[PDB]
Amino acid sequence: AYNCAISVICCVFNELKFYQDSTLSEEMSQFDFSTGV
Amino acid sequence: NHFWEIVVQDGITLITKEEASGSSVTAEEAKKFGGDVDDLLDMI
Numbered sequence: 001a002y003n004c005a006i007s008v009i010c011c012v013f014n015e016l017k018f019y020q021d022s023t024l025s026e027e028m029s030q031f032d033f034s035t036g037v
Numbered sequence: 038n039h040f041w042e043i044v045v046q047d048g049i050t051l052i053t054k055e056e057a058s059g060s061s062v063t064a065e066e067a068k069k070f071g072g073d074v075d076d077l078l079d080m081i
Binding site for chain 2: 019
């Protein structure tokens with residue numbers, strides 16, 4: 001609860017006192033697709 | 038709510054000291070003219 005209060009303080013009112021591609025790439029990808037891996 | 042407002046508005050003659058004059062009428066002219074945090078911050 002106190003941390004939630006910390007959040008509500010920090011969001012607004014954080015003051016005033018709070019009482020604290022590549023050919024090769026494409027072909028190898030196709031190769032892996034054929035592999036399935 | 039019934040205060041020196043009425044005194045001044047009717048004591049337009051005398052509301053302060055009157056010895057002879059001067060400082061007397063000068064005086065006449067001088068007067069004649071948690072929960073706390075809740076209240077201050079939650080609704081301010």
